[PDB]
Amino acid sequence: MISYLKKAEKTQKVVTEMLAEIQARGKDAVRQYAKQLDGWSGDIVLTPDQIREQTKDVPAGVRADIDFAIRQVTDFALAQRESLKEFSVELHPGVTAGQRVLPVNVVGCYAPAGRYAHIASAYMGVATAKAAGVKTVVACSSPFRGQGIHPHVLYAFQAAGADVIMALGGVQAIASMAYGLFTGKPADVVVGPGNKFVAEAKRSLYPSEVAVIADETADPAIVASDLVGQAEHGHESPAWLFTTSRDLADRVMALVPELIAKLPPTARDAATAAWRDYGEVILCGTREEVVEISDRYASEHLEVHTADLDWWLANLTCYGSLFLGEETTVAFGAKTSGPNGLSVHKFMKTLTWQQMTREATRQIGQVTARISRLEGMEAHARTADDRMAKYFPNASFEMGTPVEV
Amino acid sequence: MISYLKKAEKTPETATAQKVVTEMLAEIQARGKDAVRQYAKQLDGWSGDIVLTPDQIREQTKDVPAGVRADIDFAIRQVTDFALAQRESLKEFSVELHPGVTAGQRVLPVNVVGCYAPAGRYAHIASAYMGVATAKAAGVKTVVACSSPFRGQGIHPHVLYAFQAAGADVIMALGGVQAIASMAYGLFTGKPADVVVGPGNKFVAEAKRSLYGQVGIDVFAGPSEVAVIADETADPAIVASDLVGQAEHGHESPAWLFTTSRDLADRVMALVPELIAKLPPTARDAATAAWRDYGEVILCGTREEVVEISDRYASEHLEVHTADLDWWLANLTCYGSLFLGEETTVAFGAKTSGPNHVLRYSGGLSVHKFMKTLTWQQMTREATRQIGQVTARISRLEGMEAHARTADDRMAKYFPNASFEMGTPVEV
Ligand SMILES: NC(=O)c1ccc[n+]([C@@H]2O[C@H](COP(=O)([O-])OP(=O)(O)OC[C@H]3O[C@@H](n4cnc5c(N)ncnc54)[C@H](O)[C@@H]3O)[C@@H](O)[C@H]2O)c1
Ligand SMILES: [Zn+2]
Ligand SMILES: [Zn+2]
C-alpha cells in the first residue's frame, strides 16, 4: 500500500512587440531595449581584451574550482557524444543504407547572472555544445548594474569555450542569437534558464527539484540534508522522499525542520515555505511500488540511497538525472538536464541515406511497381518501369496492371 | 550564379482545427470511451466494435491474396532491417571521470507508442506500417495502431494486414481526433501512449500538437515532396520521371530540381509536361497543378551553391544523380532522407520520415523518436574528498549555504580526522 505521510499544500504578449520591433529594425532596436531595460549604453560584443580585464580580479582558487566543475561536465559530454554512431549496413543484397551524425552549426547560450543562481547555469550549455562539436557557441548574459557581465559568469563562459560573448539580457539576447545579430551567425538552437519573457521568447522563436529514494540502510541525516539542500532555492522547489521504511520516513520528517531552523535567514525562509508547500513523503510496500511512484513524479534530480543499487539503475525509467548511492549528491551537479533536455544529443543531427546496385532494383523495382499500382499511384510505378527498361532492356516482369482511373 | 528557370507560382493556414480539437479533447476527457464511440458514429457513421480481435483481423484480411501479402511483407522487412541497425547505433556506456566517479548513459525504449494511419484513397500503404515497424524495432513493448474504417466493413484490409504484419499489439478502428485522443489517454487499452505518430489531416496534426507538443509535430507533415540534385551526367528522362512520381500525390506536392547543368534543366523542363500528359486522368490532373504551381527548377554555378540552396529547401526526399556521390554525402546537411545515385528512387521508399522542416531539423520518425537516454553517476568516498570541497566553496560563493552543508555532512562522515577549506558560511 502507498501512504502520503506528507502531501503538497499548494500546486507573454510583450514578447510579440519586442520581436516584431527587433525583426524590423535589427541591431538598432536591440541597443535601445538594452538601454531602456538594462540601462546599458556600451558595446554588446566583448573583445578578447575586455574579457581578460573584466575577469582579472577573479582569484586563482576560484578559477580552479570553476575549471574543475566544468571538466566534470565536459568529460562526460565527450563520452556521450561518441554514443551515437555513424554506420553503413546492407539490407536486401545490393541495398546499402546508413546514418551520418552532425553537430549543429551554431548554439546560443543564455545565463541570467542573477542572485541564487548556480554558476553551473552559465557553463552547462556552453560546455555541452562545445563537447558535441559545435563550432560556434554564442553566450549572452545580462550586464550587472552597468558594470558588465558578472565576472564569474564571464569567466565560466570563457573557460567553457564560448566563441562569442555578448553583454545582453532578456528577450533581446534570445532574439539577437536567433536572428544572428552582431555575429551574422543565426543560432540553430538557444538554451539556458531565464525568466518568463525569456522562456516565452524561446517558445516563440523556437523550479529546482530533488527526490530521494531510500530504504532502511539509508542515513536519514544525509537524506534530510539533501532535501533541504535544494529546498533553499525558492518557495516553489519540490523536495520528495520515497521510502519503504517508516522509521526513516518519520526520522527524516523530524530532522528536516531542525536543519531548516539552523540555516541563515534567506535560506531559512525559502526552505521553510518550500518544504511546507511542496515537500512530500511517500511510504511504499515493495521496491516495485517505489519505482511506480518515482516514475510518475519523474524528478529532475533523483538520489537513490539503498541496498542493491544495480536493481534501481535497471528498473527506474523516468527521471532527469540519477544520483546512485549516498556518496554523490545533487549539489555536486548533474552532467545533463532532463526535459525542461540539455545534453550533447540536443546539438546533434542524424541524416539517413540509401543507395542501390542495379541488381537490387530487379526485385525492389517490381514490388514497388505492383504496390504503387494497387495504391492507384501510376506515376510512382513508372519510376520503377523506367529503371527496369534502362537496366534490364528485354525483361518482362510483373509490374502490375496500369491504373486507368 | 543562381537562376530560377521555373519559380513557384504559389505559397504554402487557419486554426479552425484548434477549436474542434479543444472541444473534442475536452469532451473525451469527461465521458471517455462513450464520447469516442459517439464521435465515431457522428463523423464516420460507425457503429461496430472498436478493438479488433485476432479472429476479426484474420477475417477481414482473408481476401488479401498471397502475392499481395508477400509484397507488403517484403516492404515492411526493409524498414525493420534499417530500424534494427539504427537502434544499435545508440550505445549504452559508462565512463570514469574524476577518479572514483562513475557516470553513464542508459538507453531504453518508451513503453507505449500509438500509430495512426490515414488510410484514405490516395495514401501509401507505407504510412500504415512505418510507424508500427519502427516502434517494434526500437523495442517498444506496446504498439497501438488506429485507422478510420474504410467502407463500413472495417479498417481497409491492406492497412489492416500492414498493421498486423508490422507487429501492432492492439488494433483499433478509429479515425481522426478521437483515435489520437484514445491512444493518448489509453482508452480501450489502459495503456496511455508516450508518443503518437502517423500522418493525417490538420485535425490529426492539431490533436497531436495539443496532446504532445513538440514530439507531436516534429515529423514531416504536409504534401509529399521530391527534390533531385543532378549534374551533366544525369539522365533527364529518369529525373523528370522521378519528379512526376511524387507530383501525382496532389495539387500541392512540390517537386524541385537543383542542377549545375543548364542542358539538363532545359531537357527536364520539356519532358515533365509530356510525362504528365500521358498519365491517367486523376494523376494527370493532380500532377499538372502540382508542377505548374509548386514545381521549381534552379540552375546553380558550382556544387557549393547547390548545397547552399538544397540545405535551405531541405526536401523530405532528396535524390542525388551526379558524379562523385561521396562528396554530396559529405557536404549536404539538411534533408529528410537521401537517395544516392540513380538506381534507388523515392518510390522505393525511405526507411524513416524526416523532420517537419516547414514549421525544424530535430525530430522525424525513426527508432530515435522512441528511445530515451537516462544519465547516472556514482561516487566512491574518496572521490568526494576533492568534489565536496569544490562544491562547498562554489556553493557559498553562490550564497547557497544549504547546498554547501550537503558536502559538509559528507566530509564529516567520510573524513572525520581531516579539515578542509569549505568556504566561509553565508550569513544573509
Ligand atoms: N501528399 C500526400 O502524401 C497525401 C496523401 C494522402 C492524403 N494526404 C493528406 O492527408 C489528409 C487525409 O485526409 P483524411 O480526411 O483522410 O484524414 P485522416 O485519415 O487523417 O482522418 C480522417 C478522419 O478525420 C475525421 N474528420 C474528418 N473531418 C473532420 C472534421 N471536420 N472535424 C472533425 N473530425 C473530422 C473523421 O473521423 C475521419 O475518419 C489530407 O490533409 C491530405 O491532403 C496527403
Ligand atoms: Zn541547486
Ligand atoms: Zn509517394
Numbering used by the authors:
A (entry chain B): 1 to 11, 20 to 214, 225 to 358, 372 to 436
B (entry chain A): 1 to 12, 15 to 361, 368 to 436
What's in the article?
Here, we study DHPS-3-dehydrogenase from Cupriavidus pinatubonensis (CpHpsN), a bacterium capable of utilizing DHPS as a sole carbon source. Kinetic analysis of CpHpsN reveals a strict preference for R-DHPS, catalyzing its 4-electron oxidation to R-SL, with high specificity for NAD+ over NADP+. CpHpsN forms a domain-swapped tight dimer with 28% of surface area buried at the dimer interface, with the interface featuring extensive hydrophobic and hydrogen-bond interactions. Domain 4 lies at the C-terminus and contributes to the active site and is also involved in dimerization through a metal binding site. Coordination of Zn2+ involves three residues from one monomer and one residue (His411*; * denotes the other monomer in the dimer) from the other monomer, showing that the enzyme forms an obligate dimer.
To probe the roles of Glu318, His319 and Asp352, we conducted site-directed mutagenesis to convert each residue independently to Ala. No activity was detected for the D352A mutant of CpHpsN, most likely due to the inability to form a productive zinc-coordination complex with substrate. The 3D structure of the CpHpsN D352A mutant in complex with Zn2+ and NAD+ was solved and refined to 2.23 Å resolution and is essentially identical to the CpHpsN·Zn2+·NADH structure in the ‘open’ conformation. Collectively, these data provide evidence for a role for Asp352 in zinc coordination to form a catalytically productive complex, and for Glu318 and His319 in the catalytic mechanism of CpHpsN.
